[PDB]
């Protein structure tokens with residue numbers, strides 16, 4: 001089977017073949033290798049087939065490796081380049097500029113062993129992952145921290161709610177995020193919504209659906225990757241599909257101990273396996289809303 | 303020109319000297335170089351100096367490279383294994399044992415060495431930041447949870463103080479509440495044995511009665527690494543010195559727009575540089591305490 005897809009860009013065919021053979025010496029992974037001899041073709045292959053790692057030559061006919069890294073645009077989800085510059089025509093200065101341009105590692109051509117190549121590719125892939133994890137931790141901290149500041153400033157509840165749904169949708173890159181407030185009637189209306197183009201907006205287009213909030217009062221969440229494989233009742237499925245909802249993430253909002261409403265995230269383009277980081281964030285945000293809700297009524301009865 | 307401390311562990315005096323000369327050629331960092339010809343002394347020097355990076359020769363008289371790594375106790379090792387050509391099998395085992403990179407003794411160039419040392423420090427730094435952020439988020443979440451559950455100030459304060467002292471691994475954290483006349487009084491305190499408790503022994507300082515802490519009220523933060531090198535006023539350093547305070551971190555706690563108190567962190571065993579991430583953590587927590595203060599005050603009325 002294929003475990004890793006790797007893109008080699010080098011105007012030397014024999015050099016590409018050498019890497020190809022060395023990679024086969026790796027007993028941990030099986031590499032599928034894309035080859036390109038020109039920088040522009042390398043860009044096309046990268047953009048089209050999303051290799052897990054890139055071996056990038058410095059001196060190429062159409063453009064040098066440094067120009068290449070500058071043109072290389074990383075996908076929103078993981079914005080770091082798994083690129084290893086390998087050159088027989090380079091120095092520590094080019095190495096520094098390569099590292100600055102987004103390369104993860106830098107190798108001299110003559111000294112490359114199979115094992116060195118393996119570890120450089122492993123290191124590049126792992127380092128990109130590491131930077132990505134750190135990148136998201138920072139963004140998650142910013143979102144949570146921003147809401148805390150708004151509560152502390154005693155900003156109106158809906159501004160806090162509007163900021164919440166907007167910022168959490170941008171972070172998750174989801175198609176729709178909305179707050180679903182319950183009434184004393186136990187009826188619920190979508191109070192607030194942040195929606196892209198993949199979803200049918202429901203803020204206005206909405207007639208009431210009724211439910212048993214035993215789980216949501218207990219603080220339990222619903223994490224559905226695919227509405228068609230979650231074993232939902234078909235009526236429930238029909239309703240979600242009617243709004244093109246494919247993946248569903250529901251987090252309960254608790255004011256006092258009463259169930260106030262729901263913090264809901266939707267993917268409408270395709271199914272989506274919700275990740276621990278994403279769920280933990282929504283939970284924290286839900287808790288903060290519960291705080292803001294309590295502050296609101298204490299201020300009102302003052 | 304930031305300073306770096308590197309530990310070289312090799313039983314060949316000529317090899318150690320060679321790498322030393324190679325490190326010095328790098329002009330982006332100034333290298334303090336420590337040397338050990340035996341693994342035992344290497345481990346010893348590692349324990350004492352906490353070097354930014356380690357060059358570990360595989361073949362030592364008393365250990366091999368892999369045996370060395372196993373004897374290490376950190377959270378991630380900035381170790382570069384140095385092995386001879388033909389022994390690349392050892393290199394793979396080394397990575398799985400904690401090493402960040404490896405070098406082939408015969409193909410060692412100064413440029414190559416610099417990249418490896420940079421990369422090792424870079425990678426270890428990233429994991430440390432990631433680990434710190436995960437821990438940092440846990441502390442913010444706990445205080446967020448307790449505020450949502452109860453409006454009990456002293457318990458929220460207690461949880462806060464206790465939690466940030468453990469995260470920072472500081473010698474003392476305490477809350478300094480103001481009186482209406484802007485006299486202060488340490489109301490809560492979490493402390494180890496490195497710092498003598500000041501919870502009942504407070505010397506009442508009245509600096510703030512003239513100033514009414516207006517600077518702190520706007521959001522001034524004090525982050526002093528060493529009270530003896532911070533250019534503090536002679537009377538101020540002596541007060542901190544009385545309580546063995548070496549490093550000082552003060553963040554204002556504000557209820558609404560009025561100064562309420564101070565969240566203070568002390569290092570007493572040694573000078574301590576306060577990191578942006580650490581400072582940011584205290585800033586957020588003071589904001590959280592202000593929120594707790596707001597609801598607790600409204601709860602009474």
Ligand SMILES: CCC1=C(C)/C(=C\C2=NC(=C\c3[nH]c(/C=C4\NC(=O)[C@H](C)[C@H]4CC)c(C)c3CCC(=O)O)/C(CCC(=O)O)=C2C)NC1=O
Pocket residue numbers: 180190202206207208209210211233235236239243248250262264
């Ligand atoms: C704009 C968006 C909007 C929604 C999403 C909404 C209704 C809606 N129905 C829900 C659940 C549900 N709704 C139904 C069932 C039904 N629903 C029906 O319209 C039926 C009559 C019925 C079949 C009996 C069920 C079974 C659930 C899940 C209850 C549970 O197990 O938690 C939920 C919470 C769980 C989820 O979102 O998946 C909502 C928010 N009304 C809205 O305006």
Ligand SMILES: CCC1=C(C)/C(=C\C2=NC(=C\c3[nH]c(/C=C4\NC(=O)[C@H](C)[C@H]4CC)c(C)c3CCC(=O)O)/C(CCC(=O)O)=C2C)NC1=O
Pocket residue numbers: 478488500503504505506507508509524535537538541542545550552566
């Ligand atoms: C247990 C620990 C404890 C402390 C730290 C405390 C007093 C104390 N004095 C402070 C500031 C200060 N204290 C002084 C001055 C003085 N202070 C004096 O005791 C003098 C009489 C005097 C010289 C005139 C000054 C000038 C500051 C201002 C520090 C600043 O500007 O941040 C501060 C806040 C800033 C800081 O901690 O550096 C405290 C908490 N009393 C305590 O029980």
Ligand code: BEF
Pocket residue numbers: 057058059060086087088089090109
């Ligand atoms: F032609 Be490449 F820079 F080895």
Ligand SMILES: [Mg+2]
Pocket residue numbers: 010011012057058059060
């Ligand atoms: Mg070339």
Ligand SMILES: [Mg+2]
Pocket residue numbers: 312313314359360361362
């Ligand atoms: Mg040796």
Ligand SMILES: [Mg+2]
Pocket residue numbers: 105106403417418
């Ligand atoms: Mg290397």
Ligand SMILES: [Mg+2]
Pocket residue numbers: 123127402421422425
């Ligand atoms: Mg690395």
